[PDB]
Ligand binder design. Structure first.
Ligand SMILES: CC(C)[C@H](C)[C@@H](O)[C@H](O)[C@@H](C)[C@H]1CC[C@H]2[C@@H]3COC(=O)[C@H]4C[C@H](O)[C@H](O)C[C@]4(C)[C@H]3CC[C@]12C
Length: 1168
């Protein structure tokens, strides 16, 4: 799209924010420049040991002096880090809060006409939340990291170059090799990740179809069949994961080998330089380490730059809306007002077209009149602007060509604080803000008194309902503690309209919630208002239009006829069509480890690699310490040989690192991939062996369960394998570091042992600061975003009942709270970070001072203090890296908390066939005992209560839908889709819950309400009903539905993608293949299903052939709300209130039972 200039992001600011940014920038610069100063001081102190091991007293003096300097640097870093973190966090929060406040103010003031619910409501709210979060991300703290790391870069180059020369050059020239190796590793990792993502996308599109059409999958046994394709796909993904692990192991090995070569070359050339006499033993350390930390500085700064660019794009997207100038302007200085209005609404040559798209015509020559103190009814046959008149009287749309007068006063010169204040409006499903009930009433009146609130609500059919709450007019509709979310939501909008007492009362089609007696209660409340008021009626259905004293009907751009409710019905003038159209109507980890038992050989090699890496670490530390000690030798001839085998040791260590990392990562990747494949197979097998009622909930569709297998199945293997590897490696390294430490010197190692918690804590804080101290900022702004969304989503309601100022107070309060939270969090984080850094530097100074003093009392030398110190510092760094994994393991109970839940979530039916006696042949004895059933998703359904029916062999049934009185539940209880609440089901003289389900399901087939095809070419979509037949009977059964000519025309013969990424077929073709499957399987019991007019097959010919071919020797059950093509030659029934009300064949039900079945005849008649 487009972006904004970056320094235009800091527009909504203040003097205080300028000061905060200044302080934060100064702190960041000081911090960054301070770290290489620490390197310089350490180099000088090491030189102080090195050049003074004959002048013992001077050693003590200089070591104490530089320990004091370390303390000073610790103090400076403390204060600087506190300053940068606190100032930047607080400034970012203040500015983003100001931006949110400005943004929400614009929407309310900006005109309402452009909000046409054409996905605009969902766009704006997500824009607000997510994009304000993005802007805050790009402003608050990442600028601090950017400045800090760029400052470390600039200070790092300067310090080495002024230190001596020629090594800040070599190291800076070499570090591009490390950078390129890391970049190549990242590129390969991204490529292999994309390939694995594609492979699992194929696997998921193969799998998720079974879950969605579970009823078809269960009916036609495919549990073994479905799992084989998943097995093949997951084996492909397993091979790809093996390759991925191999590649990442090689990448780590190669990058560490290149690092070892770099260190070897740098140390060798340094040792060359000291030999000549151009550099001491302390300057080289400073130069090398300064250059390397500069390299990491560039890495972090580049990451920050990417984040900044993304934030810039988001910020432009936000700032697009604010500056949009509106059309209608409310202004006391220009807009005037009147008094004692009369409601004489008149339209004079009103023409308008939608500004978004004016190609269509809406109100071409629109001219209607609204009387005063009366009621009018505007109704249209379709979307011809019947719902637009309310969007035109309300000043929602300016008439681009025309004039409208109010009692002789034209309305374009009236402010939107007086005209709208005299009008009351109700809309479709009036949304209620997440506040108390008493707040909703206050929309109609800000604050006058309380007695009128109770008086007006009395005549609103809600005074009794509000009393059914153990609170003082307090109810939080947001937090669903008390769930008053029934279908008949409380009509508090009527009460809030009553409180305002508007002269004008616009109406809307507020009946779209499956109107019933509950929706018929509100008719009296609606009829109680139109007394002495200039009100209208806008309706879509004429069921409740029976009481109107004047009805005007518009058809195309203009009104056709007017009059009362006496002549509109008569003369059949453009009104008979409307009524006719109306009439057509915690041992989990051990269990996981046990589940990985067969893959134990790989675990041993993985562990071996772990110990080998643990030995890699301290080896590097010891060799570096030896080089540091060697630099101070006096015999230059001896230095060459020692540096020679030290360089060879570096080369050997590089090769060793390559090999060890290869072994460890490869074998642990193999183990992890095998474990995740096994758990995926087990989880899918468990899921397919579940109850249908488990899929009925809104969280167990094909879009969530199939998504859990994506992220949860990989997280478990990641957790187990990676945590085991890292813990083993670092634990071995730590043990090696102490064992080498406590042998070379046992006194100095005790102080470092004592101060070790401080060092590990400080390094932990340093590594934690890289990802920011903010934390779940989306959750902090969880109520402001909700208030903004509710204010924007129902802005149509907010336009009336003028409340453009009351929302801002709530927004201000709920913005004030997170400002305090951010203030406290920022100050605490700054203080703790400063204390941790001060502790680190003070501890290091104390360690070195005590070491130097211990050297003085002739029981040590310049060989053991330095070695133990550097080894223990590096192993403290490694242990700090280890500790950071603890939050990852702890993180939300890392995703094996539900992986192992569904894996052992026992079902209700439990179709398991452990020892139940199997069935060889079913002859047909379908009989229903006393059975009641309720939907597990909604227990409030009591459609079934003591149902009873009997079906004999070799016949059919024609159970009508009966206005959807549980029509789609008899088919779900012939087979074990649902468990009856009470009673049993007897089939073939035996209980249903005593026999294997597979045998009963493989000889009974159904016809689904919505036929569907699997995600494959059309060769098994016809043969899915029977396994064993390949080409013999498929063609024979293909001539059951007249679609052979349809399949004759196809490029690739029979094969064609229809599920996805291929040709798309019509609705009438899927049922042909479904009937083909039904006739190919050749079952004993058949089930038919037609409902909700979902056939969508004009000129019905496929059904007639099927009903005369599939009934030869198959028992079928027919259900259809339509009273057509359901001539059951055996029996027909009607289901009412969970029991049979009449039984018999079709002939016995036509003319014999004058009664409820007559409803059926008159129904078919109206329909025709
Ligand atoms: C003078 C030092 C001994 C100093 C006391 C010490 O605290 C120092 O800050 C340590 C923690 C740093 C300084 C330089 C760092 C190294 C510099 O960068 C490197 O070459 C990489 C290579 C690789 O990434 C290793 O895993 C870490 C490793 C090898 C770094 C590991 C930690 C250090 C060794």
């Amino acid at each position: 799209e487009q972006s904004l200039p970056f320094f235009k992001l800091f527009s909504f600011a203040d003097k205080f924010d300028y000061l905060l940014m200044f302080v934060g920038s100064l702190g960041a610069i000081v911090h960054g420049s301070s770290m290489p100063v620490f390197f310089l001081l350490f180099g000088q102190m090491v030189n102080g040991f090195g050049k003074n091991q004959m002048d013992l007293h001077q050693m003590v003096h200089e070591v104490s002096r530089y320990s004091l300097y370390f303390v000073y640097l610790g103090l400076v870093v403390c204060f600087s880090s506190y300053a940068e973190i606190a100032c930047w966090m607080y400034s970012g929060e203040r500015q983003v809060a100001a931006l949110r406040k400005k943004y929400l103010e614009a929407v309310l003031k900006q005109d309402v006409g452009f909000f046409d619910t054409d996905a605009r409501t969902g766009d704006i709210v997500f824009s607000v939340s997510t994009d304000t979060l993005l802007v805050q991300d790009a402003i608050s703290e990442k600028v601090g990291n950017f400045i800090h790391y760029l400052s470390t870069f600039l200070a790092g180059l300067v310090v080495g170059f002024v230190s001596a020369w020629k090594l800040a050059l070599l190291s800076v020239a070499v570090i591009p090799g490390i950078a390129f190796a890391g970049g190549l590793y990242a590129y390969t990792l991204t490529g292999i990740t994309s390939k694995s993502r594609e492979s699992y996308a194929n696997a998921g599109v193969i799998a998720e179809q079974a879950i969605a059409q579970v009823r078809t999958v269960y009916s036609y046994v495919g549990e073994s069949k479905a799992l084989n394709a998943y097995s093949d796909a997951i084996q492909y993904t397993l091979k790809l994961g093996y390759k991925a692990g191999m590649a990442k192991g090689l990448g780590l090995g190669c990058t560490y080998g290149i690092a070892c070569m770099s260190w070897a070359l740098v140390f060798w050339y340094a040792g060359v330089f000291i030999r000549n006499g151009q550099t001491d033993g302390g300057k080289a350390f400073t130069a090398i380490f300064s250059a390397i930390v500069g390299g990491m500085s560039l890495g972090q700064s580049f990451s920050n730059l990417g984040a900044f660019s993304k934030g810039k794009a988001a910020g432009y997207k936000l700032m697009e809306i604010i500056n949009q100038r509106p059309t209608i302007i409310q202004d006391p200085l220009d807009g005037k007002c009147l008094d004692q209005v009369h409601g004489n609404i008149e339209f004079k040559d009103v023409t308008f077209s939608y500004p978004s798209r004016p190609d269509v015509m809406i109100f071409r020559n629109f001219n209607i009149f609204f009387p005063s103190g009366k009621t009018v009814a505007v109704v249209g046959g379709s979307g011809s602007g019947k719902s637009t008149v309310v969007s035109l009287i309300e000043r929602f749309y300016d008439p681009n060509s025309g004039q409208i007068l109010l009692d002789g006063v034209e309305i374009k010169t009236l402010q939107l604080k007086f005209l709208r204040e005299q009008i009351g409006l109700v809309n479709q499903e009036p949304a209620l803000f997440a506040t108390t009930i008493l707040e909703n009433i206050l929309y109609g009146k800000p604050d006058a008194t309380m007695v009128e609130v109770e008086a007006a609500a009395s005549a609103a059919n809600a005074h009794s309902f509000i009393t059914l709450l153990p609170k003082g007019y307090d109810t939080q509709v947001g937090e669903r503690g008390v769930q008053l979310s029934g279908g008949q939501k409380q009509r508090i909008a009527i009460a809030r309209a009553m409180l305002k007492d508007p002269k004008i009362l616009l109406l809307d089609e507020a009946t779209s919630a499956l109107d019933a007696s509950s929706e018929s209660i509100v008719q009296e409340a609606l009829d109680r208002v139109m007394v002495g008021r200039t009100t209208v009626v806008v309706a879509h259905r004429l069921c409740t239009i029976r009481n109107v004293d004047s009805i005007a009907v518009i058809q195309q751009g203009q009104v056709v006829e007017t009059g009362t409710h006496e002549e509109l019905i008569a003369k059949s003038g453009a009104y008979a069509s409307l009524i006719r159209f109306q009439e057509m109507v915690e041992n989990y980890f051990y269990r996981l480890l046990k589940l990985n038992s067969p893959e134990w050989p790989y675990s041993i090699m993985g562990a071996v690699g772990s110990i080998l890496s643990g030995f890699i670490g301290p080896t590097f530390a010891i060799v570096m310490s030896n080089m540091i000690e060697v630099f101070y030798y006096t015999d230059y001839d001896s230095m060459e040989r020692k540096t020679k085998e030290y360089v060879f040791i570096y080369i050997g260590a590089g090769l060793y690192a390559v090999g060890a990392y290869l072994i460890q990562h490869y074998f642990f990747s193999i183990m992890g991939e095998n474990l995740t494949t096994r758990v995926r197979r087990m989880m899918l097998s468990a899921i397919l062996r579940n109850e249908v009622g488990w899929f009925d909930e809104d969280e167990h569709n094909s879009s969530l369960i199939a998504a859990r297998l994506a992220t949860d199945a990989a997280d478990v293997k990641s957790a187990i394998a990676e945590r085991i590897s890292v813990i083993l490696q670092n634990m071995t390294s730590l043990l090696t570091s102490f064992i080498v430490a406590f042998i070379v010197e046992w006194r100095v190692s005790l102080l470092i042992l004592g101060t070790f918690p401080l060092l590990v804590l400080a390094n932990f804080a340093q590594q934690l600061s890289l990802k920011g101290f903010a934390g779940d900022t989306a959750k902090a702004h969880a109520k402001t975003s909700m208030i903004a969304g509710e204010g924007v989503s129902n802005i149509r309601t907010v336009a009336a009942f003028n409340a453009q100022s009351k929302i801002l107070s709530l927004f201000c309060h709920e913005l004030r709270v997170p400002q305090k939270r951010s203030l406290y969090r920022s100050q605490t984080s700054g203080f703790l970070f400063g204390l941790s850094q001060l502790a680190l530097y003070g501890s290091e100074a104390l360690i070195l001072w005590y070491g130097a003093h211990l050297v003085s009392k002739g029981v040590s030398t310049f060989s053991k203090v330095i070695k133990v110190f550097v080894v223990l510092v590096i192993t403290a760094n490694s242990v700090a890296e280890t500790v950071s994994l603890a939050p990852e393991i702890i993180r939300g109970g890392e995703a094996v908390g539900s992986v192992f839940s569904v894996l052992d979530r026992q079902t209700r039916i439990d179709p398991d066939d452990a020892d139940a006696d199997p069935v060889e042949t079913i002859r047909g004895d379908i009989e229903f005992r006393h059975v009641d059933f309720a939907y597990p998703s909604r227990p409030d359904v009591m459609v079934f209560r003591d149902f009873n029916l009997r079906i004999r062999a070799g016949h059919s049934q024609a159970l009508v839908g009966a206005s959807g009185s549980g029509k789609s539940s008899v088919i779900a209880m012939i087979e074990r889709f649902y468990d009856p609440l009470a009673g049993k089901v007897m089939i073939d003289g035996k209980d249903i819950r005593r026999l294997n389900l597979k045998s009963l399901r493989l000889k009974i087939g159904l016809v689904q309400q919505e036929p569907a095809l699997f995600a494959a070419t059309i060769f098994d979509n016809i043969a899915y009903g029977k396994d064993g037949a390949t080409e013999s009977e498929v063609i024979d059964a293909a001539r059951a539905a007249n679609a052979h000519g349809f399949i004759s025309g196809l490029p690739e013969g029979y094969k064609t993608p229809v599920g996805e990424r291929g040709v798309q077929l019509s609705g009438g073709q899927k049922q042909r293949i479904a009937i083909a499957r039904a006739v190919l399987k050749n079952p004993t019991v058949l089930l038919l299903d037609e409902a909700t007019s979902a056939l969508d097959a004009e000129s019905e010919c496929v059904l007639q052939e099927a009903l005369e071919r599939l009934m030869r020797g198959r028992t079928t059950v027919v259900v259809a709300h339509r009273l057509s093509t359901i001539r059951g030659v055996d029996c027909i029934g009607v289901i009412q209130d969970g029991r049979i009300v009449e039984q018999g064949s079709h002939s016995e039900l036509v003319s014999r039972p004058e009664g409820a079945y007559s409803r059926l005849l008159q129904l078919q008649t109206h329909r025709i």
